[PDB]
Design a protein around this nucleic acid. Structure first.
Ligand SMILES: O=c1ccn([C@H]2C[C@H](O)[C@@H](COP(=O)(O)NP(=O)(O)OP(=O)(O)O)O2)c(=O)[nH]1
Ligand SMILES: [K+]
Ligand SMILES: [K+]
Ligand SMILES: [K+]
Ligand SMILES: [Mg+2]
Ligand code: NA
Ligand code: NA
Length: 339
DNA sequence: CGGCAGC
DNA sequence: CAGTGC
DNA sequence: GCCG
DNA sequence: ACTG
C-alpha cells in the first residue's frame, strides 16, 4: 500500500535494512542542511519504506517494487547491500557539518546557515562573538546543547504534569493532553507538547494568558520564542521551560489551547508524527476533503483558474476516530502513527 | 515535467 | 515578503 | 529524491 | 502559523 497513514508504524519495529538506512540517512541529512528540502523528503520516505519492509531487501528488482523507491534509490541500496558502503558519502561537501551545526540553532535554518558560512563563520563561538542573531536565535544558541538532547520520557512526564497542574488550578474541568512524541509512547522526547481544551465549549477562554503568567511567575518558563495569543480560535505558545531542583536542563515546550469543537483535529495534528500528518492530509485531498489542525472539511473552494479562494465546509468530528472513519482509514493508536 | 500538508 | 517552525 |  |  502507498499510504503510510493507512499502515501501522510498528512495521518499523524490526528494521531488516538497518545497514542500508544508516548510510542513506547521512546523505539525506546532507541534502536537508543544504536546503534541498524536496530531495531530502524523498530520502525520508524511502528510508521509512526500507524500515517498514518485511524482510531485508535482496535485489534491485525487489527494491524498485517498493513504493517510495525508484531507480536512483535502488542503485544506492544495492551498492550498500553488496559493498558495505556508499561512495557518494565520500564526496559530501566539507561545508555540510558546519551547516548542520548552524541549523541546529533553534530559529536558524538553511538560509541563515549558508549566510553565516559565506561570512566565514565556522564554529558556534564564531556565531556567538560575531554573527547577527535574531531574538529567537540568541535563545537557541544559548541553549544549544540542552536543546539538541532528547530528554528521558520520565522528565517529559514531569513537565507535562507541571503544565496540567497549573492549568487545572484555574479550572478543574480542563483537559490537558500531552501530545507529540510523548503521546506516541517514545522513550525520549525532543520537547514537550501540551494541548488544552474544555468540554463545556467556553471555559478554555482566558486560560492561555493566565497559565503562561503563572508558569512565568514560578520560574518554570525561562524564555519565549513564539506566541499566538489572539488570532482566531486556537492559541499557540512555543518557549522554554526548566524543572525546579538541582542540575535541571532547559527544555523546549509547546502549548496549544483550542475550543472543544476543534479538539479532535487539534489532537490528531499535535500527536503526529509529522510524516503521518502529511500522508493523512494528502489522502484527504485525494478524497475531495481538506484536513488541518482546525477541522476536516470538504474541498477548499477555488476559482476558474484553480486558485483557492475560501475554506470548505466543516465536517463535525467529535473524536480522532471520526476523522479516520470519514477518510475510510483504519484507526491507529498514537504509538502506531510514529512514521 | 510539476507537486510534494496545512497552518 | 523571506525565513523559520509545529 | 519519487510519483503520475 | 509567527517574526521582522
Ligand atoms: O512539520 C511538522 C512538524 C510537526 N507537526 C506536528 C506533528 C508533531 O508530532 C507535532 C509536534 O511537533 P514536534 O516538532 O514536537 N515533533 P514530535 O513531538 O513528534 O517529536 P520530538 O520528540 O522531536 O518533539 O506537530 C506537523 O504536523 N508538521
Ligand atoms: K520491518
Ligand atoms: K517503486
Ligand atoms: K535543525
Ligand atoms: Mg515534540
Ligand atoms: Na534550526
Ligand atoms: Na514541539
Amino acid at each position: 500500500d502507498k499510504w503510510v497513514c493507512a499502515q501501522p508504524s510498528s512495521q518499523k519495529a524490526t528494521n531488516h535494512n538497518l545497514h542500508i538506512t544508516e548510510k542513506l540517512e547521512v546523505l539525506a541529512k546532507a541534502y536537508s542542511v543544504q536546503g534541498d528540502k524536496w530531495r531530502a523528503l524523498g530520502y525520508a520516505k524511502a528510508i521509512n519504506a526500507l524500515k517498514s519492509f518485511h524482510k531485508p531487501v535482496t535485489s534491485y528488482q525487489e527494491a524498485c517494487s517498493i513504493p517510495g523507491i525508484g531507480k536512483r534509490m535502488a542503485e544506492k541500496i544495492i551498492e550498500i547491500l553488496e559493498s558495505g558502503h556508499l561512495r557518494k558519502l565520500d564526496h559530501i561537501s566539507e561545508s555540510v557539518p558546519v551547516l548542520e551545526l548552524f541549523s541546529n540553532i533553534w530559529g536558524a535554518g538553511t538560509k541563515t546557515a549558508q549566510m553565516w558560512y559565506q561570512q566565514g563563520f565556522r564554529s558556534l563561538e564564531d556565531i556567538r562573538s560575531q554573527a547577527s542573531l535574531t531574538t529567537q536565535q540568541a535563545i537557541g544558541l544559548k541553549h544549544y546543547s540542552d536543546f539538541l538532547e532528547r530528554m528521558p520520557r520520565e522528565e517529559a512526564t514531569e513537565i507535562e504534569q507541571t503544565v496540567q497542574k497549573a492549568a487545572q488550578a484555574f479550572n478543574s474541568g480542563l483537559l490537558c493532553v500531552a501530545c507529540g512524541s510523548y503521546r506516541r509512547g517514545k522513550a525520549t522526547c525532543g520537547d514537550v507538547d501540551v494541548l488544552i481544551t474544555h468540554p463545556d465549549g467556553r471555559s478554555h477562554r482566558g486560560i492561555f494568558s493566565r497559565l503562561l503568567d503563572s508558569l512565568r511567575q514560578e520560574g518554570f518558563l525561562t524564555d519565549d520564542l513564539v506566541s499566538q495569543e489572539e488570532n482566531g480560535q486556537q492559541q499557540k505558545y512555543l518557549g522554554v521551560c526548566r524543572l525546579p531542583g538541582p542540575g535541571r536542563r532547559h527544555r523546549r515546550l509547546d502549548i496549544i489551547v483550542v475550543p472543544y469543537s476543534e479538539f479532535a483535529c487539534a489532537l490528531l495534528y499535535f500527536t503526529g508524527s509529522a510524516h503521518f500528518n502529511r500522508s493523512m492530509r494528502a489522502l484527504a485531498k485525494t478524497k475531495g476533503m481538506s484536513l488541518s489542525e482546525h477541522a476536516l472539511s470538504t474541498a477548499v473552494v477555488r476559482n476558474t483558474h484553480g486558485c483557492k479562494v475560501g475554506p470548505g465546509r466543516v465536517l463535525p468530528t467529535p473524536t480522532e476516530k471520526d476523522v479516520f472513519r470519514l477518510l475510510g482509514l483504519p484507526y491507529r493508536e498514537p504509538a502506531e502513527r510514529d512514521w
